[PDB]
Design an enzyme around this catalytic site. Structure first.
Site, PDB file in Angstrom:
ATOM      1  N   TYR A  57     -25.926 -27.721   5.617  1.00  0.00           N
ATOM      2  CA  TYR A  57     -26.187 -26.963   4.688  1.00  0.00           C
ATOM      3  C   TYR A  57     -26.559 -28.138   3.932  1.00  0.00           C
ATOM      4  O   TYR A  57     -25.685 -28.596   3.219  1.00  0.00           O
ATOM      5  CB  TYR A  57     -24.228 -26.431   4.078  1.00  0.00           C
ATOM      6  N   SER A 154     -18.597 -23.079  17.600  1.00  0.00           N
ATOM      7  CA  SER A 154     -19.582 -21.856  17.489  1.00  0.00           C
ATOM      8  C   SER A 154     -20.935 -21.510  17.293  1.00  0.00           C
ATOM      9  O   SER A 154     -20.744 -22.245  18.549  1.00  0.00           O
ATOM     10  CB  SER A 154     -19.331 -22.538  15.639  1.00  0.00           C
ATOM     11  N   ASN A 155     -21.200 -20.201  18.335  1.00  0.00           N
ATOM     12  CA  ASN A 155     -21.840 -19.621  18.388  1.00  0.00           C
ATOM     13  C   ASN A 155     -21.952 -19.896  20.445  1.00  0.00           C
ATOM     14  O   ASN A 155     -23.281 -19.680  20.624  1.00  0.00           O
ATOM     15  CB  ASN A 155     -23.212 -19.707  18.089  1.00  0.00           C
ATOM     16  N   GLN A 174     -15.642 -20.253  16.577  1.00  0.00           N
ATOM     17  CA  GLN A 174     -16.223 -19.570  15.107  1.00  0.00           C
ATOM     18  C   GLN A 174     -17.077 -18.019  16.073  1.00  0.00           C
ATOM     19  O   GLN A 174     -18.083 -19.334  16.268  1.00  0.00           O
ATOM     20  CB  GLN A 174     -17.241 -19.982  13.535  1.00  0.00           C
ATOM     21  N   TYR A 202     -17.808 -14.513  11.496  1.00  0.00           N
ATOM     22  CA  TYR A 202     -18.579 -14.828  10.517  1.00  0.00           C
ATOM     23  C   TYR A 202     -19.250 -12.887   9.977  1.00  0.00           C
ATOM     24  O   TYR A 202     -19.036 -13.120  11.031  1.00  0.00           O
ATOM     25  CB  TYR A 202     -19.636 -16.424  10.447  1.00  0.00           C
ATOM     26  N   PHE A 203     -20.119 -13.316   8.792  1.00  0.00           N
ATOM     27  CA  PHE A 203     -20.685 -11.993   8.472  1.00  0.00           C
ATOM     28  C   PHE A 203     -19.065 -10.939   8.874  1.00  0.00           C
ATOM     29  O   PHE A 203     -19.731  -9.622   8.958  1.00  0.00           O
ATOM     30  CB  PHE A 203     -21.612 -11.441   9.101  1.00  0.00           C
ATOM     31  N   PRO A 204     -18.637 -11.344   7.781  1.00  0.00           N
ATOM     32  CA  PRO A 204     -17.110 -10.104   8.460  1.00  0.00           C
ATOM     33  C   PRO A 204     -17.233  -9.074   6.989  1.00  0.00           C
ATOM     34  O   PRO A 204     -17.014  -8.376   6.881  1.00  0.00           O
ATOM     35  CB  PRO A 204     -16.087 -11.267   6.946  1.00  0.00           C
ATOM     36  N   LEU A 205     -18.609  -9.169   6.392  1.00  0.00           N
ATOM     37  CA  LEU A 205     -18.822  -7.832   5.038  1.00  0.00           C
ATOM     38  C   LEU A 205     -20.523  -7.708   5.472  1.00  0.00           C
ATOM     39  O   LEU A 205     -20.677  -7.011   4.895  1.00  0.00           O
ATOM     40  CB  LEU A 205     -18.294  -8.738   3.551  1.00  0.00           C
ATOM     41  N   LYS A 213     -20.996  -2.206  -1.719  1.00  0.00           N
ATOM     42  CA  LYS A 213     -21.393  -1.650  -2.596  1.00  0.00           C
ATOM     43  C   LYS A 213     -22.918  -1.560  -2.967  1.00  0.00           C
ATOM     44  O   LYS A 213     -23.208  -0.973  -4.192  1.00  0.00           O
ATOM     45  CB  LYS A 213     -22.162  -3.570  -2.982  1.00  0.00           C
TER      46      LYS A 213
END
Ligand code: NA
Length: 311
Positions: A57, A154-155, A174, A202-205, A213
């Site tokens: 990040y 993760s992954n 994760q 991850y990517f919950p939405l 939306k």
């Protein structure tokens, strides 16, 4: 008000903050660093315990900005989770899970955050050649020395997870999971529940699709990543919109919005203790704290489960 993250001794409020928009200039154009710092400061002021960041990040910048805000509070009142694996090679990166690389990455992360310990440290992506139990054992040397307090991966594929947890040292996993991709229920969940490994999705939405939306007439500008995903194409997209909209009466009944009902359904799973939705500004994270006060009935949970049954 506080959940225990699996086998670890980490106690946290169930809504955490994802920080890839705090200084993540390699990921987003036009970011404001003070807006990112205010997001972190307001999350902590409002009770969020866990801040989830990573080297990639901003290639270190998210961790430096979080570290600056940390000076304003008491270190023990916050739980910091960060991650490493990306290694510069030419003008991009390759993954590295070698013992010396992970230990050096923990040391460099502590310097960027300007703190003496990290609460949870993840191997961000698996590399190809390092035996995963040795990679995890390297982090355990840092845990023993007090530099980190918990280890995550993760992954990782299920086989990679089992190798990594050979000695039972993995506390958190994760992985991708949401109402439109529930594959983790068949594979990972039985294993993480049995071993008391905390599962963070991850990517919950689904890029906002599960937040109600859009409409079936929605389109996105050319070059928009959403246009590439199958959940966003043809009849599948319209079917997805129709199911999400059927969540509106449950949200009205609980006096919240659709995404709060979807996130509360993930938290109701025995396998999940905390969610880390993202945000670019302080006001968006504050809207997601509402999730914590939702108590779904068993009939609400069952209806959502069947409405989004795998096709
Ligand atoms: Na849960």
């Amino acid at each position: 008000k506080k959940a225990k993250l699996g086998k670890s001794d980490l106690q946290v409020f169930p809504i955490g903050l994802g920080t890839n928009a705090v200084g993540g200039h390699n990921l987003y154009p036009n970011l404001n660093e003070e807006t990112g710092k205010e997001l972190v400061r307001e999350a902590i002021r409002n009770g969020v315990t866990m801040l989830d960041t990573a080297y990639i990040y901003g290639i270190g910048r998210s961790e430096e900005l979080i570290g600056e805000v940390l000076r304003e509070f008491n270190r023990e009142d916050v739980v910091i989770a960060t991650k490493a694996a990306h290694r510069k090679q030419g003008n991009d990166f390759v993954f590295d899970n070698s013992p010396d690389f992970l230990k050096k990455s923990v040391d460099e992360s502590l310097k960027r955050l300007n703190t003496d310990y990290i609460d949870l440290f993840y191997i961000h992506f698996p590399d190809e050649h390092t035996p995963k139990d040795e990679a995890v054992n390297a982090l355990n040397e840092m845990k023993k020395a007090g530099k980190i307090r918990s280890i995550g991966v993760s992954n990782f594929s299920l086989e990679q997870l089992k190798e990594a947890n050979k000695d039972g040292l993995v506390d958190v996993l994760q992985g991708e999971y949401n109402l439109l991709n529930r594959e983790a229920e068949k594979t990972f969940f039985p294993y993480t529940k049995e071993h008391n490994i905390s599962f963070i999705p991850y990517f919950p939405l689904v890029s906002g699709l599960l937040a109600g939306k859009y409409t079936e007439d929605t389109t996105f500008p050319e070059g928009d990543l959403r246009n590439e995903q199958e959940h966003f194409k043809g009849e599948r997209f319209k079917e997805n919109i129709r199911k999400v909209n059927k969540l509106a009466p449950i949200a009205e009944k609980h006096n919240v919005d659709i995404p709060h009902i979807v996130l509360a359904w993930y938290l109701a799973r025995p396998e999940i203790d905390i969610l880390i939705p993202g945000a670019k500004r302080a006001d968006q994270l504050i809207d997601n704290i509402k999730t914590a006060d939702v108590t779904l009935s068993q009939e609400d949970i069952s209806f959502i489960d069947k409405l989004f049954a795998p096709g």
